[PDB]
Amino acid sequence: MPHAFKPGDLVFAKMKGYPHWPARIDDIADGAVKPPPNKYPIFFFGTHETAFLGPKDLFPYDKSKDKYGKPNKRKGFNEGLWEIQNNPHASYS
Predict the structure, then answer these.
(1) Of 1, 9, 19, 34, which has the maximum CB count within 10 A?
(2) How many CB atoms lie under 10 A from the CB of residue 38?
(3) Looking at domain 10-29+39-86, which of 2.40.10.240, 2.30.30.140, 3.90.650.10, 1.20.210.10 is its CATH number?
(4) Do the Cβ atoms of 12 and 68 come closer than 8 Å?
(5) With contact defined as beta carbons under 8 Å apart, do 61 and 44 qualify?
(6) CA distance 89 to 10
(7) Where is the PWWP domain?
(8) 42 close to 50: Cβ distance less than 8 angstroms
(9) Are 64 and 12 in contact (CB under 8 A)?
């Protein structure tokens, strides 16, 4: 049965106006800016951008990849697909 989301979990993350996007729940580095309450720091593969999202926008990767893991015209998306499949826990700093 599911647990709560934790850093390192892989997802497709939904933002208004964008397709469901390959992403991870990130750690917060010591000394770094914390997210608001009930929000997680989401690192988007490909774009390498961070946004703060709640669980309603977070779709677990294994369950969702057959639906959402297809090439997309959008900038950074297909690079993102490669990252989530091939090295989802690397440093992309």
Answers:
(1) 9
(2) 8
(3) 2.30.30.140
(4) yes
(5) no
(6) 9
(7) 7-64
(8) yes
(9) yes
